[PDB]
């Protein structure tokens, strides 16, 4: 029981709302109110934090070993997302339906790509950053916002970040936590 | 004798209880502000909830070996 004084009348140590993280080969600023989840959704998960309030709001990094050195070697950004389309999940309902509203027939979920970019960092490597809104037939959370970013590191390993935020929480302030984590993602 | 209203109106009550009562308030102030309350009761300080080993809530999960396990959960 080491005796350190209580912080009476003292200055705070963290009002940023972000915690700096350093895994293996990457570094990012996690949302400070999020906590580690013991879930492996995908093959290649290193860390996966989720929100304390609801488990829909979460992020995950994925480190796949690859044979290619640049992210342009995976093709263009449109041809890249169709390869890594497993990030958005799979429709486990192979039932036939035409009564869900705002969807194609037999589709109970429809991802919609809203933004792409080709931003880089001070090392020179370009990233493929994505912004989706995945709606469902029940329409939980008012939809789900996806923030996918991917790059290949200096060890031929594909690092993919995916920040998922429910749309209900998105306009209520989880855009600041997600975009601040999404811009902070740098693979060294 | 002394039915609770000749005490509170007496000045000898307040020549005692204007000295012992503030020095006991300060004794409670200094029990926590010197960090001794975190040591006596084992409550973690706001920089002591999460060590580098775990970033989750502790779980005691063992009955007879809990005494040295909570030393390892706290990080000592």
């Amino acid at each position: 029981a080491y005796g350190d004084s209580a912080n009476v009348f003292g200055k705070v140590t963290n009002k940023s709302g972000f915690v700096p993280y350093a895994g293996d080969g990457f570094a990012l600023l996690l949302p400070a109110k999020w906590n580690p989840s013991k879930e492996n959704d995908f093959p290649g998960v290193i860390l996966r934090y989720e929100d304390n309030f609801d488990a829909v709001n979460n992020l995950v990094v994925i480190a796949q070993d690859t044979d290619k050195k640049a992210i342009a070697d995976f093709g263009s950004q449109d041809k890249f997302l169709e390869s890594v389309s497993y990030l958005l999940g799979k429709q486990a309902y192979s039932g036939e339906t035409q009564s869900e509203g705002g969807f194609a027939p037999n589709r109970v979920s429809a991802a919609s790509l809203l933004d792409v970019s080709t931003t880089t960092d001070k090392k020179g490597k370009t990233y493929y950053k994505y912004e989706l809104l995945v709606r469902s037939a029940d329409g939980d959370e008012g939809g789900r916002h996806q923030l996918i970013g991917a790059t290949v590191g200096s060890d031929n390993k594909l690092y993919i970040i995916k920040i998922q935020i429910g749309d209900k929480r998105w306009f209520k302030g989880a855009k600041k936590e997600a975009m601040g984590a999404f811009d902070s993602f740098t693979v060294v | 004798e002394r039915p609770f209203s000749d005490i509170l109106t007496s000045i000898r009550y307040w020549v005692i209880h204007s000295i012992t009562v503030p020095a006991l308030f300060i004794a409670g102030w200094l029990f926590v502000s010197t960090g001794l309350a975190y040591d006596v009761f084992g409550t973690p300080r706001p920089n002591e909830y999460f060590t580098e080993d775990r970033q989750e809530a502790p779980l005691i999960t063992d009955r007879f070996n809990a005494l040295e396990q909570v030393k390892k959960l706290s990080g000592n």
């Binding site: - | 204007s18 503030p22 300060i26 200094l30």
Partner: peptide, 25 residues
């Protein structure tokens, strides 16, 4: 800390003086 005891010892000696300011009267 120290300032949590400095203003504490201030009124520890002020109320001792003010408690004696009416005890001398």
């Amino acid at each position: 800390g120290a300032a949590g005891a400095a203003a504490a010892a201030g009124a520890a000696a002020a109320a001792a003086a003010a408690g004696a300011a009416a005890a001398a009267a």
